Write a protein of this length. Sequence first.
Lengths: 386, 385, 129, 124, 67, 381
Amino acid sequence: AIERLRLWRFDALMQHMYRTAEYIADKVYNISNDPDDAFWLGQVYYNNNQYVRAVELITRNNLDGVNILCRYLLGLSFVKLQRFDDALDVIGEYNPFSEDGGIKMESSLCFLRGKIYFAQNNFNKARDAFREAILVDIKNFEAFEMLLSKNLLTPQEEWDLFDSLDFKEFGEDKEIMKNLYKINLSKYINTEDITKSNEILAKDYKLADNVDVVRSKVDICYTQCKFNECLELCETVLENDEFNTNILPAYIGCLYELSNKNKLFLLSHRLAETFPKSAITWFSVATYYMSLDRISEAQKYYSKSSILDPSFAAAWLGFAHTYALEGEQDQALTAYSTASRFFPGMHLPKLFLGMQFMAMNSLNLAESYFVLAYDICPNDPLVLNE
Amino acid sequence: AIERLRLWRFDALMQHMYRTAEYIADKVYNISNDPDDAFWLGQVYYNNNQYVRAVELITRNNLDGVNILCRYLLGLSFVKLQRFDDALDVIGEYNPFSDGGIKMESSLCFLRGKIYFAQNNFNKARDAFREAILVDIKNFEAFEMLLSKNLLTPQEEWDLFDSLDFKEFGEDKEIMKNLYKINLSKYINTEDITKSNEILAKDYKLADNVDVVRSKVDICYTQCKFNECLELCETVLENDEFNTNILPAYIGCLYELSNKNKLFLLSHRLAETFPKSAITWFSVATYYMSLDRISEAQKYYSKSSILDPSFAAAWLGFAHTYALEGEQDQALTAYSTASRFFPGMHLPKLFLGMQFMAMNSLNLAESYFVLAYDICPNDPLVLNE
Amino acid sequence: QYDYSPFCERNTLRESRIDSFLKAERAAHCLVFHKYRPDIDIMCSMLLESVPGCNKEDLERLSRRERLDDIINHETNALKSFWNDSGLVNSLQSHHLHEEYLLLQEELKNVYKIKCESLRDKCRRHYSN
Amino acid sequence: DDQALSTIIQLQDCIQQAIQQLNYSTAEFLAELLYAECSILDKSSVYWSDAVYLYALSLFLNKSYHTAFQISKEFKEYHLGIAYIFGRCALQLSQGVNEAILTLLSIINVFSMVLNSNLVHIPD
Amino acid sequence: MTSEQNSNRYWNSFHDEDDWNLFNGMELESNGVVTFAGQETITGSIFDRRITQLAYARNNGWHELAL
Amino acid sequence: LATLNCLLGNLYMKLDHSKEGAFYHSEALAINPYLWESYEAICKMRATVDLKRVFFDTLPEIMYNFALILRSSSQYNSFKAIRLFESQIPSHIKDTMPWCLVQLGKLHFEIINYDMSLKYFNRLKDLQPARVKDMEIFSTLLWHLHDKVKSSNLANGLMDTMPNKPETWCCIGNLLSLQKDHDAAIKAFEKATQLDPNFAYAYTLQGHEHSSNDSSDSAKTCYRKALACDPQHYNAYYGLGTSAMKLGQYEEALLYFEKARSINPVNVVLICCCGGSLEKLGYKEKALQYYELACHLQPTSSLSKYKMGQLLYSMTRYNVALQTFEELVKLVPDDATAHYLLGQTYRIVGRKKDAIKELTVAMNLDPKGNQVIIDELQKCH
């Protein structure tokens, strides 16, 4: 009966058969006014980049709020449509539920709320939203990894939050999932712990040479300036995936510091012929210009990389370096201040403002920014040396 | 143990956290090391709008020869990656094989038909789509795509509809047979489509279904019930204003009603809604035609034609712009192109014959108008011409 | 719970606007009501109650169908009618009333002039327009 | 429902009273409100046709001839006075004379739906 | 001076049409406020997502006065 | 003996004085309560009556409800009218009734809420495509929204339907002023006013365009003509106050600003302008009273909170100034000069940690004036 149509629609959606999925979703929703079928049709609209139609679908009958799932789909549709006001409207400023084997529905809502606050540059509220999202359901990981990647929490705070959260939901997979999460934790704090975790995960389980473990090893080496292990791990993982975006920034920096101009050139060409839109490729081209001492030229290419992707520390930081290295010192201050304000939670912009202020022979403000950077990150040779 | 991770990966896919989706897919794949997990990860990459990652991942260990769905995912990735020859080489030009869900062989045949449609060997596409629909009837794309571009004359479409069997549906064939019967061509056997419309309206509460309304609108458009087109399509468009299937008929009956304000509004809203669809540029060109600004309608039909090579309205409106501009030599080539790209469509040939009148060359006009009248016994344009 | 449905037909309003309207609405009523919630309450011989610039005595004469200190009384009286019982006059310094007074009638008289042709010439105005 | 009919009758009486004198804007407002109120009533009710006719007559009276012309075209067949309003609008605007003819010929031939009423300006 | 321009163009070849149209007269200022050139001006502060789609909108979208 | 009093009121309102005309409208309403035209004429001015005695001493209750709505709208207290719409006036009247649609759209428009008015009398426009009366408000809303396509719709439709109605030419001129040009807007407005005089809105827009064209005398004359047409119109008064502001003569500017505010008490632009006239006059204590009224009147307005902060810092009420500036930044982070005052207050209070970050935001916002920001940083420590 209707169940056969429902499963056929689900398979057609899963099989990337968009027309049949849309047709059958429409038919089943017309047959029965079941909001889950409406959610499915909205999902089909969502997949093929038809966001406004799904918005109007879930808006026309006011079925949002009846079930949380369609509300989340609708909010995601707005956030992709960048009508952040309406998305925050439907989701709410804070948790409305604050007092199956899958991720808790409420946790996803808090993640979306954190994402919209981040988009609105409201970092302080976004931090709380993401923390609540990860605390509510440990089954979630998008919020945890987003917070870690965007450096919205200090390493000590990151460790404290990791320790605060438990793993009771996982049960049998408690230790393996703890190690898996601990792979992605920030460095500069008790690195030996992340070490022993990655070896205990390496030999005991079949995950010996996976993408994330070698990524964490590369990050450790890059932090410790262990650059030959950096490279060897980087090529040994690159030979499998030639376009793994997770490792490309570290790889590019590591080539830059070895000044492998030629490998950098080949990577720039390969990435340009494949991913013109992504800012990573233009960052690679600009750092190729850097390796050839072309600050004035790749000034523009860092501008391009930064605009093609906001919330990218590397592009804007390099842009400020291009400002600072040769002359034009006055506005390097403004550039690094923009780095600090738009990228809170990272000690490096504050340290750079401090060292630049010392460079004008202006002392007390250099001290101020230096102590700010030290507050953000306690364990860094650069800040303490400065 | 793996089942929990698989369900978590599925949940990440459902709630569209793509980074976690790929993370968990990679983890479970490395644990199990089975081709289905690689299929899941390639599907995640596909949804990520990262086709290179998916195709490289599938091809690195040559998994296409292991399962039947991984090779299909690789093929579709090549399809959307603008690669066709290697896609067919992997899938195979001919059929290698000549419960819920649908058979995979039908999906592979459908993908092959898509590549053939991309490669302009239209007869091979017709063969592939007919084979796909006869092997499996659940694959509604093999029907809708074939009927949408008028790749075949309606008589053989009706014949193949009669030939295909709904028996394996069983208890649901009673409704799905009628639903499929709705979507065929409307010029011939018009009354049976109507009776099927009331059949769906009764006992199934599907009168509110959008595609029933679309079928009724196309019925009204066929005999030129343009007022009923306007009323019914306004009733359906209020609920949803961006149903791409509905919209061209609404443009047609609006331009027939010769009204510029509502066409103007919908065109300007669709322009900011779907900038890359040829539909909105076609609507803009129609608006300029209604305002008799031929020079701009020229370019705004050219863009729509370029965007969608399968958009007959674009070519015929293009040649209409030519004809109304004053020059006709290029309109001749335009109408010939529209006729040749879309065999079985009477309107391009009819308009080309009107142009033959415009040149006072009635000898080809006789044959062209006879051919057009062969399938349109009752419509004002044919008899007037 | 505070009702916000009539302020926006969208059944959901983000919480920032909820207090934005709530704090706005209460003081707006508090100004009119005092020279609390909106949803709990909205409430609170010659028919004409008030005319701008009309005092109670001027209303009464309608029903009948009709030196430095003294000029200061006329100084304040003139601005009482024109400013619709504005409370800032009493806070104005006395010598600041004089220049505002002279600009009042001077501006007022200009309104009187504003508020208050050969055949061949005056036909052109309709042809050209 | 007991007082619902009384309100409609009172509004109609007020509308005839207002149009009897040269008071038109008040006639406009009362016709508008009666037309809006009669929306809930079914089209078969004579009250709906009467309110539509009164609204059409008013919208004609204040020179807003276009709006009267549409509000008459929607329900021109239902009432004789609506047809009269439509014909007047058509003669002033030279728009849609043909359907005005097709309605007026039928209404006069049949006379020699709702045809007779006690309202003001009901044509003879 | 010609070598960098040639190299710029050589790498500049890798764009989509709309993407290249976005960056024809692209200029980014030090503080982060953005100037966009429409072949009007779309001056706005970067790191807010909505602005770049607004540059997309008037670039490819259809705008018109109609008297 | 009811229409005669109405006629007397119309003549009196038209000629010299609306007071006697209002008296005669009241007498006519005493004779008969169902004289809605007299009520509209009364509400054209800021005059009111005792509706309980008029309408009583369910249809009378329904009429009483509309009378209260119209009185509130004239008195410019729209929250109450919206609440009566929510409670009384059932939906099958509210949605269908075009006049209630006009009034309700106006009520939402006078509040900064813009999208809901658009929705409301856009459904109105859908119901009555040929309606021409009171469309200048739709034109003004479209001008405020900075939207051109819907204004183009309105202009084309009204020109096609009513080539001669003054509202159509008013909308044409507003669209022109929207796009780029001002002289053509003036020409359209002058055509609109020649075809139909006594239209004070056309004169108001003429004066606004003249002011935007840096022609003070022409704007003043247009506003004078507007006041001649309509004794009570806060828009032309506000324009005159702004003009005298730009000439620097604060006295008549204060006069005009207060007069505009008198007939529209709830509007933060006019409250702010009257208060600023007060400081230019030097009355710190009374100027704060209006600004204290303004922000309490409605939050989420940069201008009112900004002027609160400036005034409090001027006379050094730092404790409330700091929180006002904080909520200002909360409601908007892009104000350049505001963050400067934030940092100044933070350093005055003596919280250097917030001062450093606030000044950093300050230099980020203003590249040209970083040096003075740098100087404040030096003064910070």
